[PDB]
């Protein structure tokens, strides 16, 4: 438990208490997240939510509590050099649906960045999701949760954190934290096999920008 304001506390998410975490994500992460907001239907598929929750046992997911409620959350987990092949196979299994479209894009980015080979590190702590209650945006709750993930990464011996900023607001935040931009993929440039634009999110979100932080 880490007091980050006079009223907000950062806590680790435990394996038994994920329902309130998912309730928060479904209210304040998924509806505005550009990949989710740019594919149909608006609601995330079961496999999507299940993937996020599958990171909880790693002890790498954190929430911010205000008055006994979650007002922010970050979901992160490890990856290594097999992640590009694994994402590519996940994308083709879910091909045809919303989660398949999201994975289509995330797999293109993972294959392009390939951070473990790129930077000669054995593993990476990847941030999968970051969300802040709209009433508490502007208070660098996002930044404090990112720093918490980085400290957890250091304890775990990771030499690198990576993050795909699908949102301009996430990219601006990690820029403030000194992350290094390593890849940019504009949504208009990312097509499916039939030549159709996969993700069509609202402006101002024009690209997914992947950043890394050396630990
Ligand atoms: C790896 C990933 O998760 S990528 C996708 C990231 N998450 C999402 O898209 C869900 C959208 N949810 C959000 O919770 C937020 O926009 C976040 C977490 C990305 C950033 O929130 P914060 O940490 O509070 O942003 P930050 O502190 O840097 O700046 C917030 C303030 O409101 C703004 N702002 C932040 N987010 C938004 C937003 N989604 N829409 C409009 N304005 C925003 C400014 O950046 C800044 O304005 P101010 O100085 O005039 O007050």
From TrEMBL:
One GO molecular-function entry: aralkylamine N-acetyltransferase activity
Membrane as UniProt keyword: no
Pathway connected to this protein: Aromatic compound metabolism; melatonin biosynthesis; melatonin from serotonin: step 1/2
InterPro entries associated with the record: Acyl_CoA_acyltransferase, GNAT_dom
Catalytic reaction(s) noted: dopamine + hexadecanoyl-CoA = N-hexadecanoyl-dopamine + CoA + H(+); serotonin + (9Z)-octadecenoyl-CoA = N-(9Z-octadecenoyl)-serotonin + CoA + H(+); serotonin + hexadecanoyl-CoA = N-hexadecanoyl-serotonin + CoA + H(+); serotonin + octadecanoyl-CoA = N-octadecanoyl-serotonin + CoA + H(+)
Binding site for acetyl-CoA: 130, 132, 138, 140, 142, 166, 169, 176
Annotated binding of CoA 2, by residue: 130, 132, 138, 140, 142, 164, 166-167, 169, 176
Residue stretches making up the N-acetyltransferase domain: 8-203
EC number: 2.3.1.87
PROSITE patterns (alphabetical): GNAT
Protein residues bound to CoA 1: 32, 130, 132, 138, 142, 164, 166, 169
UniProt superkingdom: Eukaryota
Keyword terms: Acyltransferase, Transferase
Primary enzyme class: transferase
Alphabetical list of Gene3D superfamilies matching this protein: 3.40.630.30
Family to which the UniProt record says this protein belongs: Belongs to the acetyltransferase family. AANAT subfamily.
Name of this protein: aralkylamine N-acetyltransferase
Organism: Drosophila melanogaster (Fruit fly)
Gene name per UniProt: AgmNAT
């Amino acid at each position: 438990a880490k007091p980050i304001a006079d009223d907000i506390v950062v806590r680790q998410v435990d394996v038994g208490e994920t329902e309130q975490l998912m309730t928060f994500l479904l209210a304040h992460y998924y509806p505005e997240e550009p990949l989710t907001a740019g594919t149909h239907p608006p609601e995330p598929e079961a496999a999507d939510k299940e993937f996020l929750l599958s990171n909880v046992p790693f002890g790498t997911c954190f929430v911010a509590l205000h008055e006994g409620r979650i007002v922010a959350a970050v979901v992160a987990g490890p990856k290594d050099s097999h992640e590009p092949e694994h994402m590519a196979e996940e994308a083709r299994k879910y091909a045809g649906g919303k989660w398949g479209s999201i994975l289509h894009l995330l797999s293109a980015v993972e294959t392009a960045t390939d951070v473990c080979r790129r930077f000669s590190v054995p593993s990476c702590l990847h941030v999968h999701a970051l969300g802040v209650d709209p009433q508490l945006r502007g208070r660098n709750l996002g930044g404090r949760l990112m720093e918490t993930v980085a400290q957890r990464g250091r304890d775990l011996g990771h030499q690198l954190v990576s993050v795909d900023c699908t949102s301009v607001y996430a990219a601006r935040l990690v820029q403030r934290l000194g992350y290094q931009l390593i890849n940019t993929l504009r949504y208009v440039d990312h097509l499916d096999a039939s030549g159709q634009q996969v993700i069509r999110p609202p402006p101002p979100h024009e690209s997914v920008q992947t950043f890394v932080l050396h630990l």
